[PDB]
Amino acid sequence: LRPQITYGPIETVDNEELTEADMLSFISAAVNSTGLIGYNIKSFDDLMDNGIPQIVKQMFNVDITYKDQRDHTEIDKLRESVQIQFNFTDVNIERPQHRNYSQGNKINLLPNKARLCGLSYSGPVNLAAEVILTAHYSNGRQEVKRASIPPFQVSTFPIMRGSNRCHTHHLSKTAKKEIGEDPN
Amino acid sequence: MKICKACSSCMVRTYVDGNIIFRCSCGESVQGDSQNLLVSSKVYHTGEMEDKYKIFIKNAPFDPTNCQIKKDCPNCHLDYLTQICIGSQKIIILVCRCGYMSNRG
Amino acid sequence: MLIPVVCFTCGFPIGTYAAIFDKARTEYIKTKMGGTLPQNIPLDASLQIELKDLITALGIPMRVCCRTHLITTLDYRKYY
Amino acid sequence: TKVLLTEILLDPMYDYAATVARIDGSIPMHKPRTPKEAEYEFKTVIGRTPAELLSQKEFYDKIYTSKYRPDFTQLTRLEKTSTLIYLRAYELFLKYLQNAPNFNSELAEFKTYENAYGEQKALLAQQGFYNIFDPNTGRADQRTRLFEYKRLPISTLYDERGLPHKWTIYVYK
Amino acid sequence: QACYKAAEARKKGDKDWEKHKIPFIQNTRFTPQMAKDILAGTLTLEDLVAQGICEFITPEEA
Ligand SMILES: [Zn+2]
Ligand SMILES: [Zn+2]
């Protein structure tokens, strides 16, 4: 493919009044575009939205076979091994939460409470799965049982402060300042 | 090397009575005529030979990171050339986009 | 966190003119900043903002230390 | 009661709601010095006593809500302009904790408002800047004393007989 | 091209072949007005990239 855009002639560009102090505006623009640490937030948000779901849904398919050690009936004698096969279908990560010890629903956990109380700024991970169990018999017959598992919370994943799953992402600078966070 | 005519394997070289015999693991045996009289070889100064820099010298006028010199090309009469310095003897070659090459290349 | 009450070096009462000096500064800067955004003011490369006559009109002497500490002191209210 | 009070007194939300309540006089300006004062401040801020809180399962539904409801639609650029930012920030924080409808658009609207406000505050934080101008030009001085390469005549190193110079004789006048 | 035209005139016995050579010019398209527009907040690095004035370079492309 040929490039399309043709710029004006370089003979007519007027730059002789550019001072080396004017060239600091280019550095200003570069730093404003990239931020100073914006790559960290972008990388963590990519891990949250795209990375972990991909890893769980594609790189953790389990397919193993174990010898049947149950030998109490005729079918138990015929059965030789069982094939355990499952994969996860849904992966979600939420914002950090805390119980509050009221025997009530979960509430939001702000970063300053985590810092003071020695808690972890970790958001829950919800997973769903499909399980297939296949049992094999001496003659060569097999039996297959399938189950589908509703979403459940497995553990919590650490949340980068200031990232998408951080609670200081839906707050303003004044609200950040008033919940004990460094607004700057 | 020698390639077997049936299994296309690399036949083993043996020497008998002034003849080179190639024996394969399939039992095939052959005699070399002339092209198999090379037991071993070695070339020196491999990092400075002409065949090492052929692609580089061909691409030199188009690489914008090469040193340019204010000299007229005798072929296309362009007024600058590309100067490159190869080897530990610091051989200087002037090349041009048209195809001109000092050292007659 | 504020302009000091007295000059750090010689002890002249710099602070009694601090508040006034602060607000006057803003007005003076509002006269010269032009179309440049505020946070890019220390990057303009065309600004020439001189506070000499303002500090003189405050009555503060021509001492290096006093004007240094008056001009350069950061205000915590402006960053928090 | 005591464990719940210790749990909630360490919540930044509690401090923010207590500050908002102190601003408009709903609770005393000093920290509680008696258990009665602490109970009253908790009832005012959280909206219910500790015993009626755990009884049930709501927590954020009745947290203080500022008394003066200014008009935040003048935050459309159109005392004020800083009271509005503070009160609207607290109100939007409370809306966030309650998962209120249309929260995500109002948050961006207030973000633009407070970005303009921060532009003003960055104007207030400016201490001045100066550029030394070259009088010959009218902009920042580009005059330097840097080295400038210049091909000198070859006679500065060799004589008319092809020999280098040896500057080892000193002439004194 | 100007070098080629000067050569074509020189080979034809012309005594004013040197007049056909133009001077070389290299420059950046960044102007003082762009520097002022950056400070006014109306020009960003993305606009400079989109206008072909600057581009991103990696150590292997460097
Ligand atoms: Zn050529
Ligand atoms: Zn002093």
DSSP string for E1-62: -HHHHHHHHHHTT-TTGGGGPPPP----S--HHHHHHHHTTS--HHHHHHTTS-----TTT-
Contact yes or no, E with C (3+ CB pairs under 8 Å) = yes
Give contacts of E4 with chain B, Cβ < 8 Å: 76-78
Which ligand has an atom closest to residue B78 CA?
1
Give how far D118 is from chain C: nearest CA, Å: 10
Q: Is D153 on the interface with C (CB under 8 A)?
A: no
In DSSP notation, A64-107 reads EEEE----SSHHHHHEEEEEEEEEEEEEEE---EE--SSSS--E
CA distance A25 to A13: 18
- Kindly give the distance from the C-alpha atom of residue C2 to the centroid of ligand 2, in angstroms, as a whole number: 16
Cα separation, D42 vs D93, in Å, equals 19
List the beta bridge partners of residue A158: A122
CB contact residues (below 8 A), chain B span 44-103, against chain E: 76-79
- What angle do the packed helices A24-34 and E32-39 form, to 10 degrees? 40
**Technique of determination:** cryo-EM
CA–centroid distance, C61 to ligand 2, in Å, is: 9
Do chain A and E touch: 3 or more Cβ pairs under 8 angstroms? yes
User: Cα(D79)–Cα(D70) distance, rounded to whole angstroms?
Assistant: 11
**Residue E8, token pair as written in the block:** 């074509």
H-type alpha helices, B11-62: 54-59
Ligand positioned closest to the Cα atom of C62: 2
Burial of E18 (0-12, 13-18, 19+ CB in 10 A): exposed
Q: What amino acid is encoded at B5 in this protein? A: K
Q: Would you say D101 and D62 are in contact if contact means Cβ atoms under 8 Å apart?
A: no
- C-alpha D102/C-alpha D91 separation (Å) is 14
Question: Helix, strand, or coil here: D171?
Answer: coil
- Which chain C residues are closer than 8 Å to D119 by Cβ? 37-39
Q: CB-CB: which of D120, D126, D139 is closest to C41?
A: D126
Six-digit token string for B37: 């009289």
Nearest to A101 by CA among D59, C67, D68: D59
Cβ of E40 within 8 Å of Cβ of C37? The answer is yes
A77 Cβ contact list (under 8 Å, min separation 6): A71, A138
